[PDB]
Amino acid sequence: VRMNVLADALKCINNAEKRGKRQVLLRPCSKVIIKFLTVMMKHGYIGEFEIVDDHRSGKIVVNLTGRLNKCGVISPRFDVPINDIEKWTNNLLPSRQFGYVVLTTSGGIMDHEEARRKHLGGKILGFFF
Amino acid sequence: MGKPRGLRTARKHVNHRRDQRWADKDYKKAHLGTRWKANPFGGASHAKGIVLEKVGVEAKQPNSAIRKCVRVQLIKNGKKITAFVPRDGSLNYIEENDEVLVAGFGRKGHAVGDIPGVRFKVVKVANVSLLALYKEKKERPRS
Amino acid sequence: GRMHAPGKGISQSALPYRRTVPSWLKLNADDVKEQIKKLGKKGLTPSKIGIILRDSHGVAQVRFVNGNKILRIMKSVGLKPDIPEDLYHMIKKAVAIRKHLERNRKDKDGKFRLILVESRIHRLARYYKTKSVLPPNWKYESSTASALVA
RNA sequence: CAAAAGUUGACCGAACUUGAUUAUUUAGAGGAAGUAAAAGUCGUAACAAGGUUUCCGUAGGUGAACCUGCGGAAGGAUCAUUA
RNA sequence: GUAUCUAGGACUACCAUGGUUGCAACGGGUAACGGGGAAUCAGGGUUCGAUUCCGGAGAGGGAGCCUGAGAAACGGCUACCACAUCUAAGGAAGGCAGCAGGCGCGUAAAUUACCCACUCCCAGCUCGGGGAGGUAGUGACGAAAAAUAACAAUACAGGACUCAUAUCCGAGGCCCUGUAAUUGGAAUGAGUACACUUUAAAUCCUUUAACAAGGACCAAUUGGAGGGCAAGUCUGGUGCCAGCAGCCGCGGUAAUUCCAGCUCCAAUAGCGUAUAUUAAAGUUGUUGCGGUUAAAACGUUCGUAGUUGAACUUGUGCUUCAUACGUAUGUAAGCGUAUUACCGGCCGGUACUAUUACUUUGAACAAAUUAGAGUGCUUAAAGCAGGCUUCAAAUGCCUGAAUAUUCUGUGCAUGGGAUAAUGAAAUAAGACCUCUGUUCUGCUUUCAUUGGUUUUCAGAUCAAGAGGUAAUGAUUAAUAGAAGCAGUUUGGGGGCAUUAGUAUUACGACGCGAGAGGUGAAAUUCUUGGACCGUCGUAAGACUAACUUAAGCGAAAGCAUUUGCCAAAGAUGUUUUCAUUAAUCAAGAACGAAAGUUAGAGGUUCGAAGGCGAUCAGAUACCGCCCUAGUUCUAACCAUAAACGAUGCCAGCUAGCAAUUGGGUGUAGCUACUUUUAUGGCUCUCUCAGUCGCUUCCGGGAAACCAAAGCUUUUUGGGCUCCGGGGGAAGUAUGGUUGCAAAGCUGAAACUUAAAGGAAUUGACGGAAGGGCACC
């Protein structure tokens, strides 16, 4: 069915921005997705997200600036022992300056930049550039 | 597309990897130890053999040449090899029943170019080398 | 899904947003509760109670009027059938079509589908053993199944 | 009281013999393949509808190719027209 | 219990029936000791390790034993088996996988040298012994540093600058770079060689007299020059010969590939080549491949392991303070059933508290290695030296031989509470707490001592009742699935009974006659007159033309006459139920066209084989005739096909139009009718889910194409399987398995070979198709 729900929504976002389309209907929106999406907001990559209360599993409408080339999702969530943070950022990020790798860390779903400041590594959720 | 990309799928990759590496041609040769079993060198870099016969090997088309190979029996295995005599004139240097060094043609087996079934080179006759003898820098030890 | 067939076709219950309503409904939770007991004593399954009561009454949703779903209500008053109704119906169909196959052997489509009907019982029952609503190592076998329906 | 050669019963047990077993190697009348083939002999099989469209599974027969029969597919020669 | 230094099935009696396994056990193989490590890299990895250390093991293969703290010892013993030795013939004595040496094996690896001086060990020892180690000799595995010449000038050469003259063109001439075997003195010892230094004593280095430079001396190479690949379309010889070429290719008489020469290039104290490995190789894909056609979806599905898995569940904030720039809040403190409670003066303990995987920080990480700090080992490999006031006087001053990571993972300790699971308690012996002195377990102080009695204390726990406390214990129902279903409805889905139609074939009757079948034309074959044919009926078996499709169903194979029954599936619809049940799958199973096969029925038709007529060299075939097994059906096999839509399945998303299958919402639309309706079908409108098309991609692709073959990333994207990793050999061999058998599955290699495949393009060519044009 939808084993990882995360990727299904973020693919929808990519496909949408490939039309240029500012809006997407996301299904079936997780907590991990909400935390993924709040992380986007901070760096301005997407405009406002809104989670509708169906008594089912929650859908989201995305408003999109179009600043985003592409958003990818890591499953399996590979265990980062802090010094693979450096390797993972190099491979899939277009620049050393910019583009956030997204983790599920002990203290929250946080970007690798934020994770480095806290010194808390993790399991890898995602990539956003 | 395919791969078991789940968090604890962890055995399955190794199992499947070994199932896929089964087909890997270089790993088949290594694991099954084919060098020692089938290949006339036992993965041994050189072999000294005794010259049986000189062979006038007719070339594959579009080349009509008599390309001058030598039948060699290795000392370790008694295995019959046909090896080419590279650089000039050379069968005149080979002489039947001489001790000859058999080396390969750098081709992971596979028969030369247009030369039928000659997987091998000759590098030496009577411990001097062919190579020295053509240039003339050295002269053949008696018998 | 549709695990038996290729069929994508989903048709499911659209639940009205208002979790407490309906406002017009004069009838108490006791009143609806009482009818659930009476119809259940008449041998109506919780599905059959849930549909009949909506039309005859107004019972919009049994859950909304009285906080407990039909099966929960029946259980508290002890009307609960020994095996949950969804299994009872599946088990009824498997026995019925097995009895058909003894009569009309060589129905190659029927036997194939006979496997599907047992296969789903075992899987669905497997879940209920986890709930402990079915005693652990409860097994579907055909001999006992025939008796079970009746 | 000590005490040698010898020696009793035990347990470890090398070693040997014979059956069984396994791995690994290698002889061989002859049969039956494939390959290098490169000047040959016999056919034209397929490649154009290859003059019998092709080609699959399977059986039998033809010197062989292949043909044929039964069910197929199009990788056809119909992407079709045709109340 | 015994043994032993010790736990111990180590061993033995008795007594139980256990232990291990798709998380790959048991077995077999391994150029398989392990690790520290090495190689190769963008990283990730892949490969290596026999060897310089650490641990263990063994000492021809094996077994047994004494001594001694310690050996199941071999440069101890005893034995056997295998090897080897001497002998006065009775016997005895041995372990180079120790150092040298020899033989043999092989591709492959050194001296029958010297020494305890260094390093250190052992011994009774200041002292002896030491092939432990050091020393020399051998040593292009490998690494490290470069002697082999340099400058004016002369002979002519170039390029500026000048005088010029300014295509041309000459003269002066410079920092130079040179092509010259012309010159000229200089430089510095590699080598050589007193001496000194070195050393245990020698050696070489580091020192240094005496010596050594016109290369013919102090005298450099190894492959290549068509392309890859850097450099001859050179000259002689050869002429598809010899031979060359890792590959493509050269060589058939300008050979730019050969063999030389000459010229030159590339790397030069090294270079060639072989083998193994790694990069390239994305050709192994964890990172990070491909699967419509290129090598690639298992026939299809169920389905267990495996694997995976939706949403919801201490958490947001508000205020203020501090702190970057009126803000910002990120940092700090407050406030709302787990920061509550003491003691000692917020601090620090104590009392503390869901399991994990993960992750965080700590310790714990052998040195060498690896990275690298400090440092002129004269450079350097790296050594771990040495530098300083000071070469005075002098132990005076002294920095040192760090730090990290590889020794992974793990384990230990600690933090977090995200992610993914788990947790009470809805059949409430549910959670606290509290009342029964109710219950059971259960006691050292003090009754001077010590003992007996019984109270308090209940030392300290438990369990059972009753009451009060509680938000008092049931989460949504993934535009997920299961299931039922008000039901509506679909379909050539399946099984069984049944039914219809004509024909094909045969037969009779009737009826009229000498031809008929068949083709390219023919003949066989049919007829002696009644075939063939007509007509009529009937027998037999088979099958549903047209209607019938880019149309349906079924998991797929497959499924087209009628009608009845039985049960199934799917779409739609459902404010029903369940409340993650699910998704996909090794194994295993279900179904599985046809041929082939077993036994009957059945055999009309077609019709493998056979035998026939033409054709044709052949026909054995196409073609024509007769027709067997077979087609059909039934009870069994088989498990395979282009089982094909060459395209796995499940979910979401990404484009217009019109068809098309089915359901539903509106039809104040047409028609059917009852006085009109109500009903039904179709269009019209709207919408799901189906199968496709068209044209465009708004992506992919090599293109053809593909709305999937898109989202396949910029070496990534949901989940999961299966398959391919050059072409052939080969779907063969071999063994196992299944099968009655035929076969089928699983499925190599030897060896062969530089292409192979797919695509599109243009030509050529057709006994493939349409137009034209000319009295060859």
Curated annotation (Swiss-Prot), chain A:
Keywords, in A-Z order: Ribonucleoprotein, Ribosomal protein
One example GO MF annotation: structural constituent of ribosome
A GO term from the CC aspect: cytosolic ribosome
Pfam families per UniProt: Ribosomal_S8
InterPro entries: Ribosomal_uS8, Ribosomal_uS8_CS, Ribosomal_uS8_sf
Gene Ontology BP, a term: cytoplasmic translation
KW Transcription regulation (keyword) present: no
Family: Belongs to the universal ribosomal protein uS8 family.
Protein name in the entry: Small ribosomal subunit protein uS8A
UniProt organism field: Drosophila melanogaster (Fruit fly)
From Swiss-Prot, chain B:
Modified residues (3-hydroxyproline): 62
GO MF terms held by the record: structural constituent of ribosome
GO CC term (a single one): rough endoplasmic reticulum
Compartmental location: Cytoplasm, Cytosol; Cytoplasm; Rough endoplasmic reticulum
Region (Disordered): 1-23
Main location group: cytoplasm
An example Gene Ontology biological process: translation
Processing after translation: Hydroxylation at Pro-62 affects translation termination efficiency.
Keywords in alphabetical order: Cytoplasm, Endoplasmic reticulum, Hydroxylation, Ribonucleoprotein, Ribosomal protein
Basic residues: compositionally biased ranges: 1-19
UniProt subunit comment: Component of the 40S small ribosomal subunit.
Family designation: Belongs to the universal ribosomal protein uS12 family.
Name of this protein: Small ribosomal subunit protein uS12
Organism phylogeny: Eukaryota, Metazoa, Ecdysozoa, Arthropoda, Hexapoda
UniProtKB/Swiss-Prot annotation, chain C:
SUPFAM superfamilies, sorted: S15/NS1 RNA-binding domain
Pfam families registered for this protein in UniProt: Ribosomal_S13_N (PF08069), Ribosomal_S15 (PF00312)
Subcellular location: Cytoplasm; Nucleus, Nucleolus
One GO term of the biological process aspect: cytoplasmic translation
Entry's Gene Ontology molecular function annotations: small ribosomal subunit rRNA binding; structural constituent of ribosome
Predominant localisation class: cytoplasm
CDD domains: Ribosomal_S15p_S13e
Domain of life of the source: Eukaryota
Alphabetical list of InterPro entries matching this protein: Ribosomal_uS15, Ribosomal_uS15_arc_euk, Ribosomal_uS15_N, uS15_NS1_RNA-bd_sf
Listed GO CC annotations: cytoplasm; cytosolic ribosome; cytosolic small ribosomal subunit; nucleolus; small-subunit processome
Subunit structure: Component of the small ribosomal subunit. Part of the small subunit (SSU) processome, composed of more than 70 proteins and the RNA chaperone small nucleolar RNA (snoRNA) U3.
Biological function: Component of the small ribosomal subunit. The ribosome is a large ribonucleoprotein complex responsible for the synthesis of proteins in the cell. Part of the small subunit (SSU) processome, first precursor of the small eukaryotic ribosomal subunit. During the assembly of the SSU processome in the nucleolus, many ribosome biogenesis factors, an RNA chaperone and ribosomal proteins associate with the nascent pre-rRNA and work in concert to generate RNA folding, modifications, rearrangements and cleavage as well as targeted degradation of pre-ribosomal RNA by the RNA exosome.
Family indicated by similarity: Belongs to the universal ribosomal protein uS15 family.
Protein name: Small ribosomal subunit protein uS15
Organism expressing this protein natively: Drosophila melanogaster
